[PDB]
């Protein structure tokens, strides 16, 4: 049950990209418990975006997202050249299950 | 995981006689 | 409220190997715990959730049966053990720690480690 997305989604500084995945009904269509994390290599994916369309403090207001049926996308806009981050899409399958998504990877 | 939604019964109606099928489809049928 | 991973090593398959990460403060028994599994060149692949007083207990699919959860409060350190590793199974083991104290659940990962690489 992996959430499946894009490889890669192209961009360029100044733009705006969006990083969607795709589910199910039974898992992205069923809670409204959608997040989406930024990852960087070498390092831990870093939490910037849950409840679908919510972020915690200190996640830039650039990074949004929204939900529609049993899919789910994550907005980025005004990208810089430091943006540059694989991107992970989490939502609750249920039964109190957690699955990540495949993972995007934003270029700038 | 998901939940099985192929296994549906009759909810509403009047009442079903003895050893009789009922193959009729608010919504009556509900999964 | 730094966590630091530790216990990964390169083992032959079919041993049991066992993970742990050091949470800093005292708000570990406070906080759940989450286990996070990144296999090189592929996604994120969730291992179980434990809650903070480690009653009740979560675990993937994947690793049901396999991988143990368990939190030692004394010590402020959080524990993932793995039974009969197989090849197919070498990825960096990282823990994580709920947003919210006690159990939530209902939020992303507000701190997680360094990361634990895992070789079979």
């Known amino acids: 049950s992996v959430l499946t997305q894009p490889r890669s989604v192209s961009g360029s500084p100044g733009q705006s990209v969006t990083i969607s995945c795709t589910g199910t009904s039974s898992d992205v269509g069923a809670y409204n418990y959608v997040s989406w994390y930024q990852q960087h290599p070498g390092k831990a994916p870093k939490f910037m975006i849950y409840?679908?369309?919510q972020r915690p403090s200190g996640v830039p207001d650039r990074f949004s997202g929204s939900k529609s049926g049993n899919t789910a996308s994550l907005i980025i806009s005004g990208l810089q050249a430091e943006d540059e981050a694989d991107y992970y899409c989490?939502?609750?399958?249920?039964?109190?299950?957690?699955?990540f998504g495949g993972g995007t990877q934003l270029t700038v | 995981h998901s939940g099985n939604y192929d296994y549906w019964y009759r909810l509403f109606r009047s009442k079903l006689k003895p050893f009789e099928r009922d193959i009729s489809t608010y919504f009556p049928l509900q999964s | 409220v730094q966590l630091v991973e530790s216990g990964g090593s390169v083992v032959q398959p079919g041993r049991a190997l066992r993970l742990s990460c050091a949470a800093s403060g005292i708000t570990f028994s406070s906080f759940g715990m989450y286990w996070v599994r990144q296999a090189p060149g592929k996604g994120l692949e969730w291992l179980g959730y434990?809650?903070?007083?480690?009653?009740?207990?979560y675990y993937a699919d994947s690793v049901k049966g396999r991988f143990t959860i368990s939190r030692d409060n004394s010590k402020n350190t959080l524990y993932l053990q793995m039974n009969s590793l197989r090849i197919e199974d070498t990825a960096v083991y990282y823990c994580?720690?709920?947003?919210?104290?006690?159990?939530?659940?209902?939020?992303?990962?507000?701190?997680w480690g360094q990361g634990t690489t895992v070789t079979v």
């Open positions: 434990i809650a903070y007083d480690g009653s009740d207990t």
């Open positions: 989490s939502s609750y399958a249920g039964s109190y299950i957690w699955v």
């Open positions: 409840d679908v369309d």
């Open positions: 994580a720690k709920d947003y919210y104290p006690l159990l939530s659940y209902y939020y992303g990962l507000d701190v």
